[PDB]
Scaffold this active site. Sequence first.
Site, PDB file in Angstrom:
ATOM      1  N   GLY A  16       0.811  -1.200   0.000  1.00  0.00           N
ATOM      2  CA  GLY A  16       0.000   0.000   0.000  1.00  0.00           C
ATOM      3  C   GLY A  16       0.846   1.252   0.000  1.00  0.00           C
ATOM      4  O   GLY A  16       1.909   1.303  -0.626  1.00  0.00           O
ATOM      5  N   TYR A  52       1.766   2.986   3.032  1.00  0.00           N
ATOM      6  CA  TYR A  52       2.525   3.222   4.266  1.00  0.00           C
ATOM      7  C   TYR A  52       3.534   2.152   4.677  1.00  0.00           C
ATOM      8  O   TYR A  52       4.476   2.482   5.373  1.00  0.00           O
ATOM      9  CB  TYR A  52       1.580   3.567   5.425  1.00  0.00           C
ATOM     10  N   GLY A  76       6.705  -0.001   4.547  1.00  0.00           N
ATOM     11  CA  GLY A  76       8.003   0.259   3.912  1.00  0.00           C
ATOM     12  C   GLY A  76       8.447   1.631   4.356  1.00  0.00           C
ATOM     13  O   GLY A  76       7.754   2.269   5.149  1.00  0.00           O
ATOM     14  N   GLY A 113       9.015   5.459   4.950  1.00  0.00           N
ATOM     15  CA  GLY A 113       8.152   6.620   4.756  1.00  0.00           C
ATOM     16  C   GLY A 113       6.694   6.235   4.535  1.00  0.00           C
ATOM     17  O   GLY A 113       6.182   5.312   5.173  1.00  0.00           O
ATOM     18  N   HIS A 135       1.978   2.550  12.882  1.00  0.00           N
ATOM     19  CA  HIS A 135       3.348   2.154  13.233  1.00  0.00           C
ATOM     20  C   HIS A 135       4.340   3.293  12.993  1.00  0.00           C
ATOM     21  O   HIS A 135       5.197   3.553  13.840  1.00  0.00           O
ATOM     22  CB  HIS A 135       3.770   0.907  12.449  1.00  0.00           C
ATOM     23  N   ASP A 136       4.219   3.961  11.846  1.00  0.00           N
ATOM     24  CA  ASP A 136       4.985   5.184  11.560  1.00  0.00           C
ATOM     25  C   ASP A 136       4.791   6.256  12.642  1.00  0.00           C
ATOM     26  O   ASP A 136       5.761   6.885  13.094  1.00  0.00           O
ATOM     27  CB  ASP A 136       4.568   5.791  10.213  1.00  0.00           C
ATOM     28  N   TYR A 176       6.641   5.147  15.819  1.00  0.00           N
ATOM     29  CA  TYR A 176       8.073   5.445  15.728  1.00  0.00           C
ATOM     30  C   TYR A 176       8.376   6.950  15.909  1.00  0.00           C
ATOM     31  O   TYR A 176       9.333   7.304  16.606  1.00  0.00           O
ATOM     32  CB  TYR A 176       8.683   4.869  14.427  1.00  0.00           C
ATOM     33  N   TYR A 225      15.829  -5.171  20.283  1.00  0.00           N
ATOM     34  CA  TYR A 225      15.083  -5.650  21.445  1.00  0.00           C
ATOM     35  C   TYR A 225      15.024  -7.186  21.451  1.00  0.00           C
ATOM     36  O   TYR A 225      15.537  -7.840  20.549  1.00  0.00           O
ATOM     37  CB  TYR A 225      13.675  -5.029  21.490  1.00  0.00           C
ATOM     38  N   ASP A 262       6.273  -2.340  17.500  1.00  0.00           N
ATOM     39  CA  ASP A 262       6.281  -3.470  16.557  1.00  0.00           C
ATOM     40  C   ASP A 262       5.185  -4.494  16.874  1.00  0.00           C
ATOM     41  O   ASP A 262       4.501  -4.990  15.979  1.00  0.00           O
ATOM     42  CB  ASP A 262       7.654  -4.151  16.546  1.00  0.00           C
ATOM     43  N   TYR A 321       3.236  -1.735  -4.067  1.00  0.00           N
ATOM     44  CA  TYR A 321       2.295  -0.780  -4.645  1.00  0.00           C
ATOM     45  C   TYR A 321       3.044   0.384  -5.283  1.00  0.00           C
ATOM     46  O   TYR A 321       3.893   0.984  -4.624  1.00  0.00           O
ATOM     47  CB  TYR A 321       1.356  -0.251  -3.566  1.00  0.00           C
ATOM     48  N   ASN A 325       3.983   4.011  -6.177  1.00  0.00           N
ATOM     49  CA  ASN A 325       3.781   5.179  -5.326  1.00  0.00           C
ATOM     50  C   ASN A 325       2.914   6.253  -6.006  1.00  0.00           C
ATOM     51  O   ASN A 325       2.205   6.998  -5.333  1.00  0.00           O
ATOM     52  CB  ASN A 325       5.131   5.752  -4.862  1.00  0.00           C
TER      53      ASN A 325
HETATM   54  C1  7W9 Z   1       5.941  -3.789   7.385  1.00  0.00           C
HETATM   55  C2  7W9 Z   1       7.163  -2.859   7.261  1.00  0.00           C
HETATM   56  C3  7W9 Z   1       7.270  -1.651   7.819  1.00  0.00           C
HETATM   57  C4  7W9 Z   1       6.309  -1.056   8.579  1.00  0.00           C
HETATM   58  O1  7W9 Z   1       5.814  -1.566   9.585  1.00  0.00           O
HETATM   59  C5  7W9 Z   1       5.788   0.324   8.154  1.00  0.00           C
HETATM   60  N1  7W9 Z   1       4.918   0.865   8.979  1.00  0.00           N
HETATM   61  O2  7W9 Z   1       6.203   0.906   7.157  1.00  0.00           O
HETATM   62  C6  7W9 Z   1       8.491  -1.150   7.490  1.00  0.00           C
HETATM   63  C7  7W9 Z   1       9.169   0.011   7.751  1.00  0.00           C
HETATM   64  O3  7W9 Z   1       8.541   0.955   8.533  1.00  0.00           O
HETATM   65  C8  7W9 Z   1       9.246   2.030   9.205  1.00  0.00           C
HETATM   66  C9  7W9 Z   1       9.241   3.308   8.331  1.00  0.00           C
HETATM   67  O4  7W9 Z   1       8.224   3.514   7.638  1.00  0.00           O
HETATM   68  O5  7W9 Z   1      10.229   4.074   8.400  1.00  0.00           O
HETATM   69  C10 7W9 Z   1      10.456   0.235   7.229  1.00  0.00           C
HETATM   70  C11 7W9 Z   1      11.042  -0.741   6.449  1.00  0.00           C
HETATM   71  C12 7W9 Z   1      10.320  -1.903   6.204  1.00  0.00           C
HETATM   72  C13 7W9 Z   1       9.088  -2.091   6.712  1.00  0.00           C
HETATM   73  N2  7W9 Z   1       8.281  -3.152   6.577  1.00  0.00           N
HETATM   74  C14 7W9 Z   1       8.653  -4.396   5.767  1.00  0.00           C
HETATM   75  C15 7W9 Z   1       9.601  -5.224   6.501  1.00  0.00           C
HETATM   76  C16 7W9 Z   1       9.297  -5.486   7.847  1.00  0.00           C
HETATM   77  C17 7W9 Z   1      10.118  -6.271   8.652  1.00  0.00           C
HETATM   78  C18 7W9 Z   1      11.275  -6.842   8.154  1.00  0.00           C
HETATM   79  C19 7W9 Z   1      11.624  -6.630   6.834  1.00  0.00           C
HETATM   80  C20 7W9 Z   1      12.812  -7.234   6.392  1.00  0.00           C
HETATM   81  C21 7W9 Z   1      13.234  -7.062   5.078  1.00  0.00           C
HETATM   82  C22 7W9 Z   1      12.458  -6.283   4.218  1.00  0.00           C
HETATM   83  C23 7W9 Z   1      11.269  -5.682   4.664  1.00  0.00           C
HETATM   84  C24 7W9 Z   1      10.803  -5.830   5.987  1.00  0.00           C
HETATM   85 CA    CA Z   2       6.099   3.304   6.520  1.00  0.00          CA
END
Ligand code: 7W9
Ligand code: CA
Length: 123
Positions: free
Chosen positions: A24, A26, A28, A30, A46-47, A50, A65, A90, A111, A113
């Site tokens: 989607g 959010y 990944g 940003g 989650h963003d 953080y 952790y 988390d 997805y 952007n």
């Molecule tokens: C689900 C998720 C995230 C989130 O929970 C989110 N809110 O964007 C996430 C993420 O979120 C923090 C941010 O948005 O700065 C950053 C990188 C990968 C992310 N992922 C994918 C991800 C989550 C956990 C481990 C991973 C390992 C390798 C590749 C991707 C991974």
């Molecule tokens: Ca994100």
Amino acid sequence: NLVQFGVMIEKMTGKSALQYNDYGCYCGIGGSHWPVDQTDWCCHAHDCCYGRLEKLGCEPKLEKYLFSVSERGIFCAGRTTCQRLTCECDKRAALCFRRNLGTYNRKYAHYPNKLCTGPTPPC
Ligand SMILES: Cc1c(C(=O)C(N)=O)c2c(OCC(=O)O)cccc2n1Cc1cccc2ccccc12
Ligand SMILES: [Ca+2]
Ligand SMILES: [Cl-]
């Protein structure tokens, strides 16, 4: 960095953490515009989680952790309060993903952007 969260996601959802990468608008790095679905809201929240930790002086992107998964849930731990907070952020997300497994759609994985439109909802 991302190792523990990925493990937590896999344990709680039965999917690889790759399936929630670029999901989607959010999930990944940003994110912006309006979340596509409930799973995406998990990532928006989650963003926000953080961002709160960063204002407290933590570095949730980097904190290491500890956690386990029994039958009564996810147990969070760590030497510092920042590590335990990161685990709590988390945990809530991994539980949010599990809870919304029923509406997870593969079409939103990876997805583009350009398809993210609308306003950005606030935290
Ligand atoms: C689900 C998720 C995230 C989130 O929970 C989110 N809110 O964007 C996430 C993420 O979120 C923090 C941010 O948005 O700065 C950053 C990188 C990968 C992310 N992922 C994918 C991800 C989550 C956990 C481990 C991973 C390992 C390798 C590749 C991707 C991974
Ligand atoms: Ca994100
Ligand atoms: Cl440590």
